[PDB]
């Protein structure tokens, strides 16, 4: 499948899906093209103009070979507060931007818990957070709880 992406400001590029044909593959290609994370891509099917739903087959939302989607990028970087439960079980808020890395969150927690950053690890909904990836790739929300655990040695 070759789809057209039309950025609202006006410019057009083309992506190829050949793997899964999901919203993920599409967004991955747009990342390769214009360097913005999946969570920053607001996509809509043309011509209806409705949103593309994440976690739904593209062919289910009326998208086939040669169709075009409309792309708005929303750097989704307005600060929000999240909860961090630490390894002693106590919770406190932390101000973050979904555009920051997990590594940057670990630096904030390191500074306040007094533990070197490589001596602990973080999880959201049980999924271990990778240092290089932005918080928004994990779907964090106002007052989500990241759990901290020690890499006890």
């Amino acid at each position, epitope marked *: 499948w070759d789809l057209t992406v039309k950025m609202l400001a006006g410019n057009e590029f083309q992506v190829s899906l050949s793997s899964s044909m999901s919203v993920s593959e599409l967004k991955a290609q747009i990342t390769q093209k214009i360097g913005v994370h999946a969570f920053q891509q607001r996509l809509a099917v043309h011509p209806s103009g409705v949103a593309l739903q994440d976690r739904v087959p593209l062919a289910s939302q009326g998208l086939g070979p040669g169709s075009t989607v409309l792309l708005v990028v929303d750097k989704s970087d307005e*600060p929000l*507060s999240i909860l961090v439960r630490n390894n002693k079980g106590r919770s*406190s808020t932390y*101000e973050v*931007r979904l*555009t920051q*890395t997990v590594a*940057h969150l670990k630096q904030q927690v390191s*500074g*306040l818990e007094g533990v070197q950053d490589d001596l602990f690890w973080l999880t959201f909904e049980g999924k271990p957070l990778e240092d290089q990836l932005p918080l928004g790739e994990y779907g964090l929300k106002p007052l989500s709880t990241v759990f901290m655990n020690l890499r006890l040695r």
Partner: nanobody
Amino acid sequence: QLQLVETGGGLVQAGGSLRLSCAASGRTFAGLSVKWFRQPPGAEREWVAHITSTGSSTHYADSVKGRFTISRDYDRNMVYLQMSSLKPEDTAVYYCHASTLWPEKHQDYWGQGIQVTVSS
């Protein structure tokens, strides 16, 4: 560079009020996330309050919610902790703390730490 200067501590009777202050003396508080912590006698340092960098959220630990108020006077580089209905259990050394925010390089700043003794 930034230093955080704390004032306002001291001795209060149970049921009284205190306004702690945290002056931003190096640069302004712009773009910094600011928290108060306290350390009760022979206890872990515990989190108390939080005002975010845009000054538009506040968060409190359960032990102080309803009694304590965090706020900022932005024109004057000030973050306050308003403590009312103080109990003897609020006796602790109080610290204010500031964090930068992505995409700024992460740094932590800490006030010196002031004593609050609540007496009955």
